[PDB]
Structures are given as C-alpha cells and as structure tokens.
Amino acid sequence: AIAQLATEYVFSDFLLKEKGLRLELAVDKMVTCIAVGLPLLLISLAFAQEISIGTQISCFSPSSFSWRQAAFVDSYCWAAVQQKNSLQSESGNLPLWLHKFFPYILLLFAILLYLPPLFWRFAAAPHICSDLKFIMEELDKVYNRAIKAAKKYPIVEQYLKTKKNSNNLIIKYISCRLLTLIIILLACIYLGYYFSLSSLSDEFVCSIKSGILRNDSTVPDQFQCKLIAVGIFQLLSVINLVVYVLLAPVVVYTLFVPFRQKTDVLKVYEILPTFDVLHFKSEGYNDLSLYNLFLEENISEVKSYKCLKVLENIKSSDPMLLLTNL
Amino acid sequence: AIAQLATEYVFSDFLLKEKGLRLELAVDKMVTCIAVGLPLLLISLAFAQEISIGTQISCFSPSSFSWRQAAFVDSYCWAAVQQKNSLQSESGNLPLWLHKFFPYILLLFAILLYLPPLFWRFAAAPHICSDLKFIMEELDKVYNRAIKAAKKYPIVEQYLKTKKNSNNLIIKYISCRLLTLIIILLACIYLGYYFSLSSLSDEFVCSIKSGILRNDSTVPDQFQCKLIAVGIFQLLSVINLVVYVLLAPVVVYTLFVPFRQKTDVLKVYEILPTFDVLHFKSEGYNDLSLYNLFLEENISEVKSYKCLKVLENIKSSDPMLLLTNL
Amino acid sequence: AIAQLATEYVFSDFLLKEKGLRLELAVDKMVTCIAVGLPLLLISLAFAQEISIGTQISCFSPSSFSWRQAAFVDSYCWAAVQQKNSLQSESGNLPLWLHKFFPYILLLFAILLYLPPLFWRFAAAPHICSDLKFIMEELDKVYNRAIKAAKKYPIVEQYLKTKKNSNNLIIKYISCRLLTLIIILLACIYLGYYFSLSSLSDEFVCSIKSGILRNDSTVPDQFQCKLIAVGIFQLLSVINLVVYVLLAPVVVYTLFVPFRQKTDVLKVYEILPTFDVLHFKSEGYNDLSLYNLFLEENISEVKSYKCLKVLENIKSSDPMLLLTNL
Amino acid sequence: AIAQLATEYVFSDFLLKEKGLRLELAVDKMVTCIAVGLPLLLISLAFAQEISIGTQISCFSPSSFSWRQAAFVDSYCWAAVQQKNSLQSESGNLPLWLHKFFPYILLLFAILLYLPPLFWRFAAAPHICSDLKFIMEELDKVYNRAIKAAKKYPIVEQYLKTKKNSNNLIIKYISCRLLTLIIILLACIYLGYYFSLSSLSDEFVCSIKSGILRNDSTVPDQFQCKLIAVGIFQLLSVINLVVYVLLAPVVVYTLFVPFRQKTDVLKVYEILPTFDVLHFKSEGYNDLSLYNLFLEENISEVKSYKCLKVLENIKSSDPMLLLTNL
Amino acid sequence: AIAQLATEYVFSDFLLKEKGLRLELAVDKMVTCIAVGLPLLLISLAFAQEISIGTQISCFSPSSFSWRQAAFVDSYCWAAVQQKNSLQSESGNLPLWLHKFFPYILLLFAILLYLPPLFWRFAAAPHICSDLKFIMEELDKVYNRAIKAAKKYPIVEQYLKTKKNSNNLIIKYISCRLLTLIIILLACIYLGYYFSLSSLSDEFVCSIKSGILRNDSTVPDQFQCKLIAVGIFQLLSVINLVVYVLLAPVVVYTLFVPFRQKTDVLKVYEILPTFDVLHFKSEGYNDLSLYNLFLEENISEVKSYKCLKVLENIKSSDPMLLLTNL
C-alpha cells in the first residue's frame, strides 16, 4: 500500500541507521536520504495500487477485434514506442521514450545520487573514522590526566597541525559534494524538461503493420494510444524538481567547508590547564576544517567535553569548580 | 516493486557484509558486487510490475479465433522460437533465442562473475585470513614489548621473508582476477552484439501447422509475432555494457599487484626501536606483494599501528613522545 | 523473481553454513551444494515469472468451442499424457511422461544427491567430530606442555595408530562418495537422453472421447497439443548435464583418499621437542588417511599449529625462536 | 515454488532440531521425519504451481452453455462426487471419493505417523531425559573421583540394576514403534490399492438434474468429467509406497531392542579402577536395554567417556597413561 | 498450502510453548491444543487451495444471462440463504444457515474451548505458579539442610496442611474442566446433527425477484443452487466428532482429581531424616489433591527429588549412600 510504502521510506530509518561514532555528519545524511529516496518514493507512489487504473497503455482497437487482438495491439505499441518507424507523434519519439522509461530514469538518478555518499563510505570513511576516534580517545586521556593533576609533549596538538598541512581528505569530501550537486542540477534539468512537456506527448498513433501485416486487407492503418500515468509522472516530476531545487542551496552551503563556523568546540579544551593543545582552528580549505566539523558532530558524545563545556557555560553566565566537578 | 528491488540490491549490503578481519580488500568487493548484482538488478528491472505490460509475446490471431485459440498461438510460438522449422524471420533463429533467454544469459554471466570471488573465498581466503591475523597479533606483541621497554629473534621479519619467496597465493589471486576480466570481456562482447541487433529481430512469423494442423482447411499460414520487452532488454544491455566497460579498466588495474603502491604502511613499525622487522617491501609478483595490500586494508584496525602512525605524522609535520603516548 | 531465486540459491549460504569445527571438508560441501541445488535452481528457473508464458499445455480447440470447453480440452490432455490409449504421438508416451514430470525427476535427483551427504551427516559425522576435536585438544595440550618446558606416554601417537588399523569410517566415506558418483552418472544418463529428444516430442494429439463422448456427433477426433517449456527443459537439461559432467571428475578425484597428499601438516608437530607423536602418515585405505584430510581442513583453526608452522616456514626460508615465540 | 517447498521440507531441519541431550535416538528421528514429511512433501508436490494446470475437474459443457453455467457444472460435479445418486461411474463412487480426498487421506496418515513420536515426546521423554542426564552427571562425578585418586557404594550400578528390573519404559517404546509400524502397513495397503486403480476411475459422468432441473427441457442428461491430477496422485502414491516399503524393515529392526548390540559403550567405565559399576548389560526386554541405546546415543557428548574410550582404543592397538591423560 | 497449514498447527508448538515451571499439567495442554486447534485445522483444510474448486455457490443461470448477471444470481442467493422468504428448500432454512456459517460455528466452538484454559491461565495460574515454586524452593532448602547435617519447625508440612483445608483452587480447576466437557458435548451434538443432514440440504432454489424484479417479464422464477463444499464440511464434521468423542472420556477422567494417583512422589522426601514434612496425601476434593498433581508434573525438574528418588529406587531393588551421593 501507499501508506506501507510511506512507512518503508519516509518514516523508517532508510539510509540513516547505516553508533558510538558518526562518520557522516549532519546535512550529508539528510541530503543523501532525501535525494536518494525521493525518486524511489515517487516511483513507488507512481505505481501504487490506488493510483494505477490498470494497463499503462490502451490503444482503442475496433469492436471487430477480439480480446487478445487488442492485447496484441497494446503490447506491440508498448514495445513500438522504441523503434522510430513504427509510430508517428506530434511531440516525437524522445518524449515517448521518456514516458516509457520515466521510472528507470528517476531510479538512475537515485543511484547516481547514492554514488558519492558510497564513495565517501569507502574511500574516505575509514580514515576519518580512525582519526576521529583516536582524537576522542586522546582528549579523554588528556582530561583524565588533568583531573588526576587537579585531585610532556601534547601529541594531539602536533597531530592536529600535520593534518592542517594535509588536504587530501577535504579534496575527497568536496569531490563527493560537487558530484552530488552536479547530479542534482542534471536531475533538475531533466525534471524541468519532463514537466514542461505538453501532456499530449503521451498521445500517439502506432501502426501494427510490420512484417506480414503490411499487406493485410482488414487492419486499421493506425491506432490512437495514450500512455496512462504520464500526467502522474509529470506531477511527481514537478514535486521532485521543487524538492531538489530546495535541496541544491543546502548542497552549495555544504561545499563551503570553512564558512560552517564551528562555535569554538575545540576551544573548550584550551580552558583546562593541562590541555595546552588544539588552540587554533582552520581558516581555509584543509583537512583540519573537515576534522573540525566531524569533531563538532561527535564531540557531544565525548565524556569530558560535556563536563568542560558546562564549566565554560557557567563562566559564560577560578578553576576550583573543575576539581570539584571531577 | 522496482524501489523495493533497488533497496534489495543497490542500497542494501548484498555481497558486502559477507568483521574484525577483511579477507576481500577494496575494489575486489566493489567489482564483485557491481559485476554480480548488475545483471540481477537489470533482469529484475526488465520484468518490474510497471514496465511489463503483460504477456511477453502476442501474435495477432484472427478475429474468428477464440480466446484460448489465441492463447494457443501465443504459447506455441513462445515454445517455437526454439525449433528451426516452425518459424521464419529476417534476422534468424539465434537472435530470437537470445530474446527468449536474455535473462538466463545475463544471470549466467552474473554467476560466472561470482565464481572467481567464490573460489577466492574458499581456496585462498583461509590462508590469507590466518596469516594476516597472525601478523596483526605478532605486531601487537612487538609494540607491547617496545612499550614495556620504553616504560631476541624477530619472527615477523623472517616469516615475512619466507612468504616473499613464495608466490602460490598471488598466482591464485591473479587467476581469480584474470578469470573475472575474461568473463567481463565476454559479457561485453555479448552485450555489444545483443544491443547491435536491429530491434526488428523481435518481429517474426510462426506457423501453428505442425502435426494434424498441417492439412487443416482454416488456419492462417503464419502469424505476426513480436517479442515484447526486447527493446527494454536492449536498453538494459547498453546500460550493462557501459558499466562493464567502465569496470574493466579497474580490473586491469587490479591485476598489476606491485604497482598498487602501499604508502609505507609497514615502514611505520621500522621507526620503533624494538621493532627491527619488516624493513623491506616487494618489487615483483610474490605473495608478499599481496600481503602488503591486505595489510594496508587491515592495519588501520590494529591498535598499535594507529598510534605509531600518529607518531610518524607529527614527525612529518627524539622518541620521547612514544613513551609518553603509551 | 529470478534474481530473488538466484540470491536464494547461488549467492546465499544454502547448504554451506549447515563453526569451530568443520565435519564436511572442502570439495564435499562444494560438490553437495552444486549437485543438490542446481536441479533446484534450474527447476525454479524453468518456471520463473518472466519465462512462463502461461498455461503449460494449449491444444487448439475449434472456434465453436467455448472458453471452459477449451479449458476442459487443455486440462484433460494434461491429465491424459498419463494413460496410453487416450493419446497418440510420434515419439511415444514415455517422452511426454518425462515432459510432464521433468521437475519431479530433477528434484528426485536433487534429493538423491542429498542422501549420501545426509547419511554422512548422521552415521559418520559424530565420530569424526568427536575424534577430531579430541585430537585438536590433545595437540594443544602437547604444545602447552612443550612451551612450559621451554620457558610420559604420548596418547596422541598410539590413538592415531589404532585408527590407522581401523577402516570403518573410510568405508562409510567412500560409500557416500561412490553413491554420489553413481547418482551423478545416472543423472547424466537421464539428462543426455532427455536433451537428445527430438523437441517435437512435446507435440502430440489427444482425443477427448473417453466415456459418453465416444459417440457424440460434434467433437474433433483429435486435438493438436504442444507441451510448452519443453525446450526450456531441454536447455536447462544440457546446462545441468554440462555442469554434472564437469563435477564427476571432481568426485572421482575425491574417491582416491590417499592420493590427496596432505603436505606434512601433521609433520609440523614432529619438529617440536616434547611432541614426539604423529611422525608417520597413511599410505593406503585406512581411517587415518581420512583423519589426515579432516585434520588438514581443521588444523589452521588450531592455536598452536599456526605458530609452529610459522616456525617451520622461517626454517624453510636452533629452536631458541620457539621459546621466544611462546 | 517446488524448490522452496523442497528447501522447506527435505533440506531444512523439519522435525530434527525439535541440544545437550538427545531424547530421540537415531533412526527414530529419521523414520519419523521421513514418514511424517513425505505425505506432506508429496501433497505439496501434487499441487505445485508448475504441475497444476488449473481447475482440478473440468466437465465439457456444451458450446451453448455460458461461462458461469460451465462453472456451475464443474463445481456441482466436484460437490457431487460425494452423493451416490448424482453420478454414475464404471469404477464406482469410492475411488472418486479417494480422488477428491487423496491429500486429506495422506495428511491423515502423516498426522497418524506423528502421533507415536508425539506420545513418546510427552509420556516417556521426561523420564528418559531426567534419568539419562542423571546417569551422565554421576559418571562424570565417578571419573572426577577416579582422576583425583590417581593424581563407597556406587549408586550408578544399583540404580542401573533397579531399572534392569523395570520394563515400563520399554513397553511404552515398543508400543510407539508398533503403532508406527501398523500405521506404515495401513498406509502401504492404502497406497497399493490407490495406485492399483485403473486410472480411468477419474473419468465419470454426472447429471446436473437434481431439484428443478430434473424436468427442464434443455440440459444434457450427463456430462463427461475427468478429475485432473489423479495420475499425479497415483505417481506420488507409488513413490510413497516404495519409500514406506523401504522404511518398514527399518521399523521392524527398531522393534528388536536387545538385538541392537551396543558395542560395550558402558564397559569402557569398567576399565577404570574407581568405577566398579555398570559391568553387565541387558539380554532381554527391559528398561535397561533401552537405556543402553540412549546411552550409546548420548555418551559421546560426555566429557570423560571420550578420554577413557581413547585409553581403551590405545589398548586395542598399565593404567599410568590415564593418570597422564587427566 | 495444506502442508504449510499442517506444519503451522499440528507439527508446530501452537498452544504448547505458551520454561522452568509448568502451570498447565499433562492432558490439560494436550486436550486444550487438540480441542482448540482441530476446528481451526479442519476449517483451514475445508478451504485449502487444492480442495476449493472456486466459488462456493453456483446457481445455473440461463444461457441468455450474461457473466455479471450470473454473478448477481450467485451473490444474491449467497446473501439470500439468510432471509426466509427469498428461497424455498426441502430441508429448510436452518441447514442452509449452518452450511453458510459452518466455519463461523466451528471457530466459535474453538474459541469457546479456549475460554476455560484462558480463565485458568489468569484466575488460578498465578496462585498455583507462586505456591508451587515456593514449595520447590523450600524442598530444595530442606534437602540442602539435610545434606549439610549428613556431611526446627517444618514450614512445608503445615503450609501443605492449610492448603489441604482449602478448596478454592480445585473448585476453579473443576469449573474449568466441567466447562470444557460441556462445550465438548455441545460441539458433539452440533457435529452429529450437522453430519446427519441428508447432503441434499445444500441443494436449494432461490428467486431473484425481490423489489422491481417481482414484475419483470424475463427472469426465471427460481434458480437451482448447490452450496459447494457442504460435503467437505460433513466429512470434516464426522472427523471432528470422532476426535471429540475420543477426547471426552479423557476430560471425564481429568475431572476425578483424587483418582489420578500420584505414585508417592511426595513420599520420597519422607525417607530423608531431616525432611519430616509432607508425610500424608489427599483422599478427597481439596486444593492439596491438585497440588499433588502439579507437583508430580514439576518435581522431576527439582534438583534434589531426582537424587533422592534414585536413592529410593536402589532401595526398591542404611542411609550412608545419601551422604555419599551428596
């Protein structure tokens, strides 16, 4: 059912569950889930039980034709939207090709939108995963040492600086998001072209006259056929186009990594006396700018950051309290 | 539904899940999943609920024929694409054979593409599994001994050298990938031949005249039949051919084992004082070249390598810090 | 769907999962899975949704006959391939019997191929299971004692010798594999005979004239019927015959137990000083020859064998290292 | 599908899984699973998707009759195999009754074959369960005491003797197996009678003339009907009869409890010095003869029996080794 | 399928699983499962895929009537077995009412048979549950104290006596079993009356003449209708009646609580020296008579009772052995 479909896609997890670590920050998962599942959701809505009257093409055989003769006419003209010579139409052969393969094309866009998140989930996900969990563990060790002192060389600061120098991972990230934006724009171009079709493009005339039926006495020369659900495809197309047009500015915002403005989440550790590491922050296209965003995603999960952020918040309203907080 | 099919194949795990150890390195799993599942995905897309109008062959019986007489004509000509004498066609009997058994042939290619990964998952997978987990355990023991020293005979170096001498496992690996490449090229040849068919090959004429109906007064001599979804098969064929043509250079890259260039992942252990083992690396077709790749897959999972790689990265930006890192 | 069927049989576990111990060595599981599941897979492929046009037999009733009268003709002639007198055919009654009961016969061969692995999984599996896990535990105890010595009577050697004397279990194993080979050859004989049928054997004429219709004025004397999917059965038959013809040499290789040549897997324990047991190996048809093969299957899982095999491999490139390896 | 059915019954567990203890010894589970599931398997094979052409009875209404009039004729004669007066047939009313209720009768035999294993699984299963696990625990305690001595009153011997005196449980067991054998013989009698039917018993003539249609001008006096799949029922009947005829000697062998000849499995404990209990064995119809068989099923699972049997086997090739074995 | 139905009801658990404690003793679960599930099993067998020819009522419209006109006739007469005036029949309106609502009536009997076990599983199950597990725990404590003594006031004896005085729980139990017996007898009365119907009760004549069709020129006055599967209902009715007639003596045996004769299961604890409690047993309708039966169900699960019963059994073939048994 359509409601079972809605629970399957919109209200279920879908590509959201896949625990301690989150290697796909906010917006990414949101953008990927909407962009991938909305062609799937709208295809499945296109052919729901309630909305599909029946056979997609009907062709108006004469009354003299039998049941299976009309079945031949319908099935032949369904197959004969493909070849050029068999049919004539005012719009042309290309919009009928789009009408037949609308769900194929939208599923192709869904898979194409799934490709850059997948290439992220293999090529760059283990590196960000291992590096971020190591940084979380090291920061927990630093706070444990500070708490022990309250009751030599900071590895985290220099390991943060050497990734400030590197920019391979951000190049992978911006390549993923740029491919996603390009595919969204191409899907917008297709959906705008498809919805802008006259809606008489589904109307066409086909002749069942190839082969021996070219020189048969009693067959109609041509058969009026309509591709049913083309209007449903156009309605779902404008819906998909509207949602993708809303989604594309979010992706363009996602491209600008340094503008995202993490609100001094790493600066909270600078307040502690022992933790002299991680004072600075990125101001450009580097790996560290992306590490700051994945940190700002995953740092609330850290044991110590929440306590030290509470210590910072009460200041926002002497470090004796920190010893007391433990 | 087509969307349920897409979630079943593209977005689900498929042949990806099957934890601590990964005995199928990157690209392999990617190439195997795409090459195996894309014939499955495109077959299931070929006969989706929306795209299938109904019966695959219709044959245009006369109006005088009843419903089940036309059913006989359709079913007989479906069966009679097989035998040579029963039908005549401009293209021939072979393309009609391909049209009837297109999903059989693509599933045969999917299983044939699944064979070399399966022969890897039995013949060579236990050996690489046991050897790699032993190497991981030994390297963890070496780092534990080094950390204990900081706070005689390295088995790993000589056990690495004796596999430098051996080349049975790489012969198995290159045999698997060569069989995969050969099957991909054969599938490309078939899909190029199938898509290059004129698309009037589906059109054919069959006579329901074998047996007693040879000398019956009132039956048509021949019946115009079209194999519906042959154009859908050709569209999915060019899609499969395009994806496999993209996939084949990746397999050819996968053949060249020593060119893969692990970026001194084993050299990180040379920096430690106690770990004097594993200084060198392969420069040819040996088992060690494949062990380096499986190592570079699985070494990020190792406890010690990540810490010692952080120690190497800060140098990239005295070993006192290592004692401090613990 | 056919792709769901393929994931159910070829790509899923099937008779592969059913952990620490493997009481069905390599090839056995491979041969059993292919031989059992390929009739199942090809039957399910025979009647897939895409390939089945509809009713399996159609019979060309006259136009005067109604819908349910033609349904009677089809259903009667389906039932009347059984009895001899009701029909006449050029090939005979036996090939039509095979055409009706092709999936029954191939499923019978699948179950018959499943019988010897099942009789192995009950009659001989507990004995090999208990004996092999006891041998693994005893060898682990021997290596633990050797490691303790490095830092009286070997039970394993004499318990190995007394099974060298016995040959009941190998008789059970060779009986299982001989029954499997005989059933494979019988299936090859059937599939070769079935594929060699002319493919006009499906064509036959039946008379709906038994009982009161013997002396009815207006019924045709005989009705041209074709058994649809017989050509599909013949194509799947030659596929099954080709795969079984490939499989039979593997079973014949599996019969020769002593020729299998375990590569001194038990000899690795002879290198240790304390482990003076298990020096020799079989050179004939005994239980010990089969125990060597199940050992060579399961010995990589053993804790100590991998370490001592690494010690042997570095030698292949004084036992001081063993004390160091621990 | 038929292959899904085969995986559901033959290749799945079925009545095999239902861990440490096995209260249904070998052959019993085998005989119960085959005898119960083979009527189920052959019924489900009788009405598979491929083998069922459609409606089971067709009756050849005149061409003047409409679609639903022929539907009435088919449905009425299906119902009117029951009453005697409505139909006439050469064979009689009883074989048509068997043809209509063949799957009911075979399922009745399946449930009747399931009754004695069920009455075993309630009436006698807890007693054999508790007694056998107590005997296993006591024998483990005896070997633990013997191992402690190596490094007064044996309860097991007298508790074994008092069950030598009793014979209630063996009476229950032989009653179960005798009921199973009697039901197998009755099923063999039915299947032999059913297969021996002429196969024109399915042919019969029925009159739709009860009630107001007795005195209606235009209806045929009688309608030629065939019960389709009766030949399929006869083929499956001879298959079931052959398998049950093979199964019945196994049940007759299962009746003779003392002849089963446990190979001195309890005598292995006599070799130990401390374990002076359980020297003798049954030579008649007693509870102890059945306890020996359930012991010989479950004693390989025991920790100590395997070690002491290894000690016995090396002798088969001074008890110093036992102290060493531990 | 019918075989899937059989695995769902007969061979699966059904109302058998619902672990340490069993608050529904033997026979109860057996009687409840058979009595509840056999109407369910026979209803599901009544409308299996193989046995149902199609529409349950067919009515023999004239040939002039169209397809949907005959559909109206069938559907109207199905609805018009309800009202008295619309139809006339030799048997009457009541047996046609039973024929239409046979599965409703048998499901009503199944639910009515499920009511007394359900009222047991709420009203009396917690009390017997808590009391029996407390008695098991107290007896285990008594044996632990006796074993400690071997190496003041018995609460169990007086707590057993005060429930000897009470009879509320046995009144609930006998009310449950009496309601079950009464419902079984009522179902037997119904099934005997239903099977004793002439089997021409399914034959009836209905007039589609209410409303505007009372004064329409061309409709038949009355239509011969048969309710198909009424004979199947009668066969399943005699099967259900036979099984319930067998079941009713078991329920009548279950009513006599004190006659059930627990074989001195509580007397085994009297043999121990410390356990001076629970010497006597019931000889009438009391709560203690039911507690003895639930004890004899659940006492084999007790740790100590099995050991002390082994001590009693060897006597059946000085208490020094008990100290030795521990």
Ligand SMILES: O[C@@H](c1cc(C(F)(F)F)nc2c(C(F)(F)F)cccc12)[C@H]1CCCCN1
């Ligand atoms: O909730 C899921 C969802 C799916 C889809 C669609 F269609 F992609 F599957 N569409 C949605 C729409 C929309 F407006 F687009 F319809 C609005 C809101 C949520 C939608 C998503 C969103 C991100 C987090 C959870 N998975």
Ligand SMILES: O[C@@H](c1cc(C(F)(F)F)nc2c(C(F)(F)F)cccc12)[C@H]1CCCCN1
């Ligand atoms: O995601 C799965 C996938 C399957 C398939 C197909 F069809 F093989 F099943 N096709 C895919 C395409 C394609 F472009 F080919 F359509 C593009 C991207 C992913 C595809 C794969 C890939 C590897 C890791 C996870 N399993």
Ligand SMILES: O[C@@H](c1cc(C(F)(F)F)nc2c(C(F)(F)F)cccc12)[C@H]1CCCCN1
């Ligand atoms: O992978 C499974 C498989 C099944 C089948 C079939 F058909 F038996 F089910 N056929 C297969 C073919 C074949 F060429 F025969 F088609 C080729 C490769 C694998 C096949 C098997 C094999 C052994 C280990 C895992 N189970």
Ligand SMILES: O[C@@H](c1cc(C(F)(F)F)nc2c(C(F)(F)F)cccc12)[C@H]1CCCCN1
């Ligand atoms: O494997 C299962 C099986 C079921 C059936 C049937 F039909 F009873 F379900 N038939 C079988 C046949 C037969 F020859 F009879 F077909 C041969 C071999 C195994 C069969 C059984 C057997 C006992 C252990 C596992 N459950």
Ligand SMILES: O[C@@H](c1cc(C(F)(F)F)nc2c(C(F)(F)F)cccc12)[C@H]1CCCCN1
């Ligand atoms: O096994 C289950 C079963 C159900 C049914 C029915 F029909 F109630 F569901 N009928 C049965 C018949 C009968 F003869 F009655 F058919 C005979 C034997 C067992 C039957 C029951 C029995 C009690 C323990 C397990 N649940």
